[PDB]
Design a binder for this molecule. Structure first.
Ligand SMILES: *[C@H](O)[C@H](C[C@@H]1CCNC1=O)NC(=O)[C@H](CC1CCCCC1)NC(=O)[C@@H](NC(=O)OCc1ccccc1)C(C)C
Ligand SMILES: *[C@H](O)[C@H](C[C@@H]1CCNC1=O)NC(=O)[C@H](CC1CCCCC1)NC(=O)[C@@H](NC(=O)OCc1ccccc1)C(C)C
Lengths: 306, 306
């Protein structure tokens, strides 16, 4: 038993990380087949970043201005193009380590693993949730741009996030692998509002089920509630409203524990209204919302990949 | 910026994971050069586990009784031996993916990444601390035995932990790669006491420095303290006593932030005596002790590996 925030094994993604340099700027790229993907702001100087005209900036660049290193194995750039906020560099060699892969645009509340990288070299791996306001709470320093987020389904890597910038609150923003930002953000160094974040209610409930499965369970109470009654409580505490779709997604955990979803909602409502009274659940003194149901099921069924 | 509990990239270790089967029991092994390492309890049946005579049980076994699969690539066993609580199977093929590696026995309070594995296939990766009572708080199900803990120093993997069992409190116990348990535990299915755990004070202080570096810093107070005065507080709250060696290890973080170590101890003393009053530090409502100083420095300097 035990429950930990767990990232996917990163080896398949490690073999795809390269370094991209344009002039003074170095960041990470993702090398799949004969294409390298990276943030288009690799082309910006420190004064372009305040209000860049990316079309005009890219026109000044030719293939030979993009330096791509894989380790110290190095790639010849034979074409370049901009797709939304990502630059796509065609290279003359297909990555021999390309895994089976897909590009996916994830939904708010879903989770993924981040392989944080500097100069094309992996530094660490951790699990993130895409917040309801389309930010992530990551760990990113200068040079981490182009680091990617991903999920694995057995042998297939689903890339879902590429890192671009940090907002004025320490939270992080980036794009899918077609270069479309999650949320309202633009790749300009200017003040940008993320807007109110909310707690991912279905994930909190999934984590309460994980706690029961692991014997942590003082919070189970006597009451039940209704989906409309609970949602009145969710509103006051900035929790996402719970829908029947969420109830259905929680079905397997409900069946495993024998605790009806609305009974668990009643326990959650009392935790929200009364706090935890200095106690903990699965080692946390806060209600955790970065585990999806489905993360919970895999962690307590032992799903593997390769 | 931002601070996350981050594991090492796992690819170098993924290429070393194999499946070991003896009779009815399947677990994970570690394949380095021409040797496969796994828990010796792979030889036990469900009624051996209550009081096993490992010498007598192993004598019944020959090389051909140990089935080792690498993926579905499969290895011929040409010798076997028991070293403390690990079994070492000599195979006829050296692992072509063997990284540069060392076996290390870590100290209590140090951290490492765990690659949780089932049937020789990686499932996930997370960071653990070896508690002062020589347990870890992991996430391990049936079949995870033989999963390993490790650190990376650029290109060298230091293996430090192999998982063996779960105690009567949900905490986990295992050995170094020479098969010596951390702590007082034996590989028998019998009630076993871990003894009182304590909080890793130098790690809490390192994490408070990480918080200041990230602008989280309401807890900085007006006071200072002495190492002897602070240790009186540490005693009452089951914190490890702070030594000058710990102060010296905190030197770089002290120099980076301009906060004297004993001033940070005074902030910690007030957090211990008064709690956090419903506030958070780096997203946690508890004092976190599973980051070493040195983890903090790498996370806020961007150290990479490959
Ligand atoms: C690429 O390695 C970095 C990664 C960030 C550095 C520290 N944490 C990070 O996640 N990205 C950048 O340095 C960004 C440069 C890009 C160039 C032009 C296109 C968009 C930005 N810049 C940032 O992340 C900066 N944040 C930012 O621009 O947010 C807008 C803002 C500015 C002022 C006040 C409010 C909001 C970051 C602060 C360095
Ligand atoms: C190998 O895959 C598993 C991993 C554990 C299963 C669930 N969580 C785990 O970490 N290891 C085992 O199943 C252990 C078998 C070994 C065979 C004989 C040598 C030592 C054990 N068994 C356990 O981990 C069990 N725990 C245990 O034996 O602790 C001692 C104990 C027993 C009763 C009351 C107090 C303490 C576990 C409970 C299945």
């Amino acid at each position: 038993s035990g429950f930990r925030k767990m990232a996917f094994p990163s080896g398949k993604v490690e073999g795809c990380m390269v370094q991209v340099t344009c002039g003074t700027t170095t960041l990470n790229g993702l090398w799949l087949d004969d294409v390298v993907y990276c943030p288009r702001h690799v082309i910006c100087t420190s004064e372009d970043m305040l209000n860049p005209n990316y079309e005009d900036l890219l026109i000044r660049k030719s293939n030979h201005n993009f330096l791509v290193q894989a380790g110290n194995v190095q790639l010849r750039v034979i074409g370049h193009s901009m797709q939304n906020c990502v630059l796509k560099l065609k290279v003359d060699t297909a990555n021999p380590k390309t895994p089976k892969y897909k590009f996916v645009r994830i939904q708010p509340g879903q989770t993924f693993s981040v392989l944080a990288c500097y100069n094309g070299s992996p530094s660490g791996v951790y699990q993130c949730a895409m917040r309801p306001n389309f930010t992530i709470k990551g760990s990113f320093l200068n040079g981490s741009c182009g680091s990617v987020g991903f999920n694995i389904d057995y042998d297939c890597v689903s890339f879902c996030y590429m890192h671009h910038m940090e907002l004025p609150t320490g939270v992080h923003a980036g794009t899918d692998l077609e270069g479309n930002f999650y949320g309202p953000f633009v790749d300009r160094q200017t003040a940008q509002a993320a807007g109110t974040d909310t707690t991912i209610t279905v994930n909190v409930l999934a984590w309460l089920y994980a706690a029961v499965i692991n014997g942590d369970r003082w919070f189970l109470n006597r009451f039940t509630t209704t989906l409309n009654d609970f949602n009145l409580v969710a509103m006051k505490y900035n929790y996402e409203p719970l829908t029947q779709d969420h109830v259905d997604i929680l079905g397997p955990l409900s069946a495993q524990t024998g605790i009806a979803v609305l009974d668990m909602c009643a326990s959650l409502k009392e935790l929200l209204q009364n706090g935890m009274n200095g106690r903990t659940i699965l080692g946390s003194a806060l209600l955790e919302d970065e585990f999806t149901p489905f993360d919970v099921v895999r962690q307590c069924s032992g799903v593997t990949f390769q």
